[PDB]
Structures are given as structure tokens and as C-alpha cells.
């Protein structure tokens, strides 16, 4: 869905999507806003 805008979902060729958080400088695979 629409992310908090700190992180962007990029697709790695291994077949996994990862969020690069430019604000917290941290990686997390899946959409955290879909958590609720």
C-alpha cells in the first residue's frame, strides 16, 4: 500500500522485495503500513 515515505520497496533478483528506509537507514522486507 502507501508507505510512510521513509522506505521504498525494491525487488532483488533472489526473488525478495526489501524496503530501504532512507530516514532510519534500516532495511525491512515488507510493507509495515499493511500491518494494521
Amino acid at each position: 500500500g502507501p508507505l510512510p515515505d521513509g522506505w521504498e520497496q525494491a525487488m532483488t533478483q533472489d526473488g525478495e522485495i526489501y524496503y530501504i528506509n532512507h530516514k532510519n537507514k534500516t532495511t525491512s522486507w515488507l510493507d509495515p503500513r499493511l500491518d494494521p
Partner: peptide, 12 residues
């Protein structure tokens, strides 16, 4: 797996 370092994008 732990997500790759945000420093750069994995090409694999």
C-alpha cells in the same frame, strides 16, 4: 533472511 544493508542495492 535478514534484509541486505541499506547502503546499497543487492544485484542478486
Amino acid at each position: 533472511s535478514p534484509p541486505p544493508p541499506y547502503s546499497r542495492y543487492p544485484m542478486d
